[PDB]
């Protein structure tokens, strides 16, 4: 059921700016296996908290 394109989805959905958006999805772009993708879909949870303070 959930994919890859989901996340990217998930990116392209909250109010993020154009640097960030850009640098991150190159990130995730740059993902292989999984605990380390999940890693980095961590660090865009936190980004939003961030950015939303």
Partial sequence: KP???????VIES????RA???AY?????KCKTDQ???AVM???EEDI???TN
């Fill in 20 to 22: 960030e958006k850009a």
């Fill in 42 to 44: 961590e660090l865009v």
């Fill in 14 to 17: 909250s109010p993020l700016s």
């Fill in 3 to 9: 994919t890859m394109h989901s996340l990217r989805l």
């Fill in 25 to 29: 999805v190159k990130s995730l772009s």
């Fill in 49 to 51: 908290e961030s950015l």
């Fill in 36 to 38: 380390e993708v999940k």
